[PDB]
Symmetry: C3
Subunit: 497 residues, 3 copies
């Protein structure tokens, strides 16, 4: 009935309620304090975010290509439940649904007219734009996801422990994680994953309303935005309470199939030789200047460009890493550490770059051809970039409708996917909690997205993400260091006949 | 009296004769058809050529630095027939002997006034020219050659099958390679190797007639070029009347000694500190932006520069790869996979880069010091680049004469060497075919070179090379993926006490 | 009484006396002979210096990451006398630290108004300056130091041989090192380390006099410079004779603490976010263009910039490497080769780069913010760069006095430290020589510094350093190739059940 963890459940509820009250009955105060706080945090700790993501990626590479990579998740006498192709498909399904569909065109074009670093020619501007979107989506995001998923899988399969952030700090804290010391980590993890899920929720909402406005000229107001959010979460709780089926795996497969069909349609109807040439060239350039852009901090110029694009992306990945890592760990049992890390790092990191090329590089090809019309639309609003990019394609209305449907299905999938992660983190156990708690948490994330959207749109999701992702960046660093020790202890124990 | 393979010998004769007949009865038709076909193929599949060469090089590096590198060629109970120094010395002479002399000077200067990418200063133009020259000749070519030689040696020594391209696909096709399925593989390999050897023959004859015209002011019609071709082939077939007495290894050592003496003379008489400094700096820059230039596809500019220089070079290295790999594998028995790959990748690549520095960087030093006279000559024709370069050196006539003699001897060695590869591929066995078959194949190679020369000069060799190297690029990728399987099988079978 | 090595003692003393004579009774001739000779050697062998340092660094990396890295120094039955932190702390204290205080500010600003390569924007100039000072101080210096220290430790602990340069060539010279073939090696090593210590002493005294002149407006004639030199050396020999005996380690710890406090104070009072951002970004850029700047030889421009900055630094590191490597080996017993190399290459290099950032990047931040006043001072003279840098900080006089005291104590430590190495190399044994010989060698290095100062200032230390570092570059290459054989011998001997 009420199987909960009080010090985590009540603390998260109280903190979320306090934030909602602050943002709903101090309008001007919250609207003035949030962007100043976000700017201060990002300006002061962009170096720390960059160092954290680089260290996590280097640690993932090291774990993949060391003696620790021979350890098989779930024990030596375990076998994978899925083939490599299915595992890779599910890994790409875990990332990314809404962020990809929202930024794949807005970001490469926003790095064209607003370059991260000064360039002279438009060719170099396009190359730099593709390089920076590859940096944001290519390997560091999947590095963080792979590290969190590896930690969760190792400490929930090889250690017979709940796959929350409590058990990830066992090796160096012993039994102290059970009382008031792992409670803080669980609270921070729940808050960070809730805010990351709510950011994805909000991104989907803004893009779906922009698409409806562009297609039909409808005059939307935040009232029907809230109505859309409530209706979608109602569909989710209907699918949860009166379960038609396991509407996650089948919906994940449908989403992957529809996204692949969309990518193939854009690849064929748009440029085809240009897309392949640009994919090869841009991946090579991204891997050639990897250390130059990964560690770049904009220290000498001081343009402040990283405060909205790069540091925000690192904070987002770090903050909502628990949600992605949970489902990365669910589907990876019986696969060794090296194979797991390489599979999470490379294949989804390559498919994401392929999608980035297929969409953003095609947009940049249109722009470089003199057809500057996405630049003006994105300068007006970045939520219509996809629906302006589909204007110069055959079946513009059908492609726009399919993109809206894909966004809405990713919306349901994320809402029904992160709800169970938050429920498990909040109430412990492994899913014995009743469905009403899951529905309540879905409602909470929906209203959090609603309040954040009404408090600035795409200027309050980033603020909360960065604010709650900085301490979670610290937690990620400590968690990587503790996972090293736990893996070393397990390897030493196994190598004893 | 002809030990032959009917479906390979007859098919190769038929397609070669059909191409010759088409080129001789339809001058204008073939002269319009061939450049268009080559341009279409290169424009559509430059990305594929780049991916193929990069993947082959990465596969070679992986095979050198993994557990697969401990496998000893010819079995554990085998010892090298040559010392490491002599093996390294004769490795460089194995392939690209005539192309080195043709493009040692014409290519770095052609990348100066016709830059691959836009540059402002002449210094950057020279650096880029040397970088792209090193890319074309440094490591990818020797990566392809090392992979092909490793596959040939593994499947002709460790597994005892005949050393043709039929046996390289045994692991994943079973016994199907013996009939009408590996026949196509052998036909394509023979065509690619004959069209890659005819390209070198054409380069040699073009440069030798250009040198004769430059030195003596003679007017040589295509009839005298055909006479030169026939005279050289007659000398080659006289040398293989019955023996006599197998003047190939001695000629190979003489060619290596003469080329080394020529390089030392150019190094001493020309700049000596500049060449050494530029060698170090250019090798460092080549290894610094290796991924930047290897994966570069010229996609945002579309200048078409890669259609003649880079894609043609990849198709050339792939096309005549059987010929180079055969004699790379002949002289490598008893050497482990790691040592073999590192000795075919590094040492001959380093010596090639040293030669190309000694010649092209010296030419660029002459150009950068206000003496722009190789640019004007190369813009007119590229076959007189070396003979114009030797103009500003002491003993210009003697150096030109020894260069012509070295080109003629490389011509003889290549004609006598590739006939063996074509004859072995066409007739199977391991050298049981009669001498008249070798004579006929040398004649066919010579007339193919003559016909390609009369059909456009240095515009039909590239066309044929690219056309027959694209499907051979596919075959190279498949063979690279099958070699790891067929060699992991041997590694597993050997690691069984 | 007179326990010496007469072939080494007599030859080194006679050569030093001859140089002092030709510098003190041939002013006009030597003042033209020395800079011309230095320019000749650096121009002719900059490529050799670059190749030598790159090969040494690559060899150190390879030895750290191969089967040889498992070899435990001092034998398997040995343990580290110090913990990891206490060893990392004193690794950086072994040197540099006198040139650190001299070129922390003068070098990154001298690379600003006098760029190694042409740049347009001031931001690019600052990035290039930071990159090149990182190259000079980051990894190649510590690579040379790690190689020399590893050779010395391996041949003085695992082989029970004297820790001089005699024993480093045992593997392929056998007992021939004991007479007239290893005597030359010891003589060259003693001369190189004496001249390196003299260059450090000259830098220290130059900066001390410059700081005194800047703070107090004093006029210091070279007579007072000689008086200061003699006073400091007299303090050192008084400590050696009467004071004694372990205070060198106490003074080393005091120097490390004072330098860390000075660096922290500059980090806090000056920019704090800028320094961290620039540290991360500049380390990333240094590791991104590593092969581009390490192998750069300035061959296409011929500006001559490398003759005073990069080649001089390589020659300096190579020349005084025996002194640094001796104390790197003393404080490293019972540590495996991999751990030793990774702890000498990385951590001291990282701390040196952090010091360069904290000081030079702060200076570049001041310069880039319109405050161009260090540029004029450094153009006038580079010795007062640090004292002009502290002008725009709180507690300018206190920080200047602390820097002067730190330089003076580094002077004392370096003299008392290099006297041990010179005495041990010249008289053999392991510290049985009388104290009078030690103080005599300290006096000799002091008068060498005085004579070199009176012969051109900072134009004769570099000359002698380069002249005696080129043959020592050859010797370092030979010993680096000898260590592999002599330590593979030990690895094979140990791996025999």
């Amino acid at each position: 009935n009420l199987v909960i963890n009080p010090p985590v459940f009540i603390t998260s509820i109280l903190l979320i309620v306090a934030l909602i009250l602050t943002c709903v009955l101090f309008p001007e105060k919250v609207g003035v304090w949030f962007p100043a706080a976000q700017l201060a945090v990002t300006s002061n700790f962009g170096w720390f975010f960059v160092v954290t993501v680089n260290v996590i990626l280097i640690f993932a590479i090291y774990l993949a290509f060391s003696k620790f990579g021979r350890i098989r998740l779930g024990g030596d006498d375990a076998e994978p439940e899925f083939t490599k192709a299915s595992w890779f498909a599910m890994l790409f399904s875990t990332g990314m649904g809404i962020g990809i569909m929202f930024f794949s065109i807005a970001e490469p074009v926003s790095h064209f007219f607003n370059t991260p670093r000064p360039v002279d020619t438009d060719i170099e501007a396009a190359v730099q734009a593709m390089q920076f979107t590859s940096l944001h989506w290519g390997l560091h995001a999947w590095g963080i996801y792979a590290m969190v998923g590896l930690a969760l899988a190792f400490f929930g399969f090889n250690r017979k422990l709940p796959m929350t952030f409590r058990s990830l700090f066992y090796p160096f804290w012993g039994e102290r994680i059970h009382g008031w010391w792992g409670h803080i980590i669980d609270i921070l993890s729940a808050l960070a994953t809730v805010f990351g899920l709510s950011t994805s929720l909000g991104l989907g909402v803004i893009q779906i309303t922009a698409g409806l406005e562009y297609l039909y000229g409808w005059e939307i107001s935040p009232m029907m935005q809230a109505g859309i959010i409530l209706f979608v979460i109602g569909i989710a709780t209907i699918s949860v309470f009166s379960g038609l089926d396991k509407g996650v795996k089948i919906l994940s497969n449908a989403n992957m199939y529809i996204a692949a069909s969309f990518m193939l349609l854009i690849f064929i109807l748009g440029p085809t030789l240009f897309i392949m040439k640009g994919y090869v060239e841009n991946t090579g350039a991204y891997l050639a200047n990897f250390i130059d852009i990964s560690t770049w901090n904009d220290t000498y110029l001081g343009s402040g460009w990283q405060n909205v694009w790069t540091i925000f992306y690192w904070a987002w990945w770090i903050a909502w890493s628990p949600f992605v890592g949970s489902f990365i760990a669910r589907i990876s049992k019986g696969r060794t550490v090296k194979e797991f890390v390489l599979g999470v790092l490379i294949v989804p990191g390559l498919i994401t770059l392929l999608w980035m090329n297929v969409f953003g590089g095609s947009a940049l090809h249109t722009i470089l051809s003199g057809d500057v019309t996405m630049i003006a639309a994105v300068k007006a609003d970045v939520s219509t970039a996809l629906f302006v990019f589909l204007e110069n394609f055959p079946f513009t209305k059908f492609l726009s409708i399919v993109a809206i449907i894909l966004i809405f299905s990713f919306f349901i999938t994320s809402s029904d996917s992160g709800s169970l992660v938050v429920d498990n983190i909040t109430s412990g156990s492994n899913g014995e909690s009743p469905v009403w708690q899951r529905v309540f948490w879905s409602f909470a994330q929906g209203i959090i997205a609603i309040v954040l959207l009404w408090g600035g749109g795409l200027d309050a999701l980033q603020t909360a993400v960065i604010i709650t992702g900085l301490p979670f960046a610290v937690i990620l660093l400590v968690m990587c260091y503790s996972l090293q020790k736990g893996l070393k202890e397990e390897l030493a124990k196994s190598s004893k006949k």
